């Protein structure tokens, strides 16, 4: 697979390849998203979920949320990609988490990035100051927090105020990934992904992991593409049989715009190449990634 990468890098064709993907990508209708009663539920007016793969709230009032189920049949994993919640969609976001039985949330943006507000503060930052979402009958409490240098893992308790059932949700927050940019290194990315993997949040007995950033297509797309490719490599039991480009086009049947720059696509290759070492049998490269990540202090 490194052959294909070494060539593109010498030829400098990354932007041409990325443009090729945009041209070939699926184009399905988004009628529910464009209804006028849903205008205030969309963060960006050029980013919408397809009708056929959108998540529906179990709600009679309005079942709409800007979120898409990305079901990778062959890799046998599902992801929910969504926009960073808005002040009025925090209750819907956690309604979705609950109804879809998600166990993990991956957040790849910061609440404020280069000036502009990218996301609402949708989870509690202090144990003693829990959030109640009255519109959706949910209560959310911070339980503990594991702060590392470039990411933080929080343990949250989601309580359904109707039934008093409670569930534990793991929140993985990547703090050093700029909008329209890439991670510092494949090591810090893969260390983050394997932390998510190790938690069990991606296990198929749970509902789909929820992944978001600002729009839920760029950094969110990079994260899900790398994970699925490494899944395919392991399942087929053949590294260089995985075509990153075809996998990304498959994902874009479920949500528009996944992977937002040509450099994010280059990084995706770089990350799958580096991750192949673990899949091939070098299980100890994982501890290497942890060291190159500088996750302590």
């Amino acid at each position: 697979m490194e052959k294909e990468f070494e060539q593109i890098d010498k030829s400098g064709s990354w932007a041409a390849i990325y443009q090729d993907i945009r041209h070939e990508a699926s184009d399905f209708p988004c009628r529910v998203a464009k209804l006028p009663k849903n205008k205030n539920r969309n963060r960006y007016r050029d980013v919408s979920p397809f009708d056929h793969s959108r998540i529906k709230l179990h709600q009679e009032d309005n079942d709409y949320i800007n979120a898409s189920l990305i079901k990778m049949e062959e890799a046998q994993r599902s992801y929910i990609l969504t926009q960073g919640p808005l002040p009025n969609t925090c209750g819907h976001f956690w309604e979705m988490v609950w109804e879809q039985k998600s166990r993990g949330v991956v957040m790849l943006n910061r609440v404020m990035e280069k000036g502009s507000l990218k996301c609402a503060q949708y989870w509690p930052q202090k144990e003693e100051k829990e959030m109640i979402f009255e519109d959706t009958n949910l209560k959310l409490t911070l339980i503990s927090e594991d702060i590392k240098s470039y990411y933080t893992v929080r343990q949250l308790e989601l309580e359904n105020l109707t039934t008093q059932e409670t569930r534990e949700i793991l929140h993985f927050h990547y703090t050093t990934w700029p909008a329209f940019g890439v991670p510092e290194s494949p090591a810090s990315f893969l260390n983050f992904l394997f932390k998510v993997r190790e938690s069990g949040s991606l296990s198929p007995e749970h509902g789909p992991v929820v992944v978001h950033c600002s729009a839920g297509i760029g950094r969110s797309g990079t994260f899900c593409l790398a994970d699925t490719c490494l899944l395919l490599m392991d399942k087929r039991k053949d590294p260089s049989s995985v075509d990153i480009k075809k996998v990304l086009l498959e994902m874009r049947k479920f949500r528009m715009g996944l992977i937002a720059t040509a450099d994010q696509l280059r990084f995706s290759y770089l990350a799958v190449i580096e991750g192949a070492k673990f899949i091939m049998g070098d299980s100890s490269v994982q501890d290497q990634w942890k060291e190159l990540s500088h996750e302590d202090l």
């Binding site: 960006y44 007016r45 050029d46 980013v47 729009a215 297509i217 715009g257 937002a260």
Partner: peptide, 5 residues
């Protein structure tokens, strides 16, 4: 408010 800004 457009993603392609």
């Amino acid at each position: 408010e457009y993603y392609k800004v």
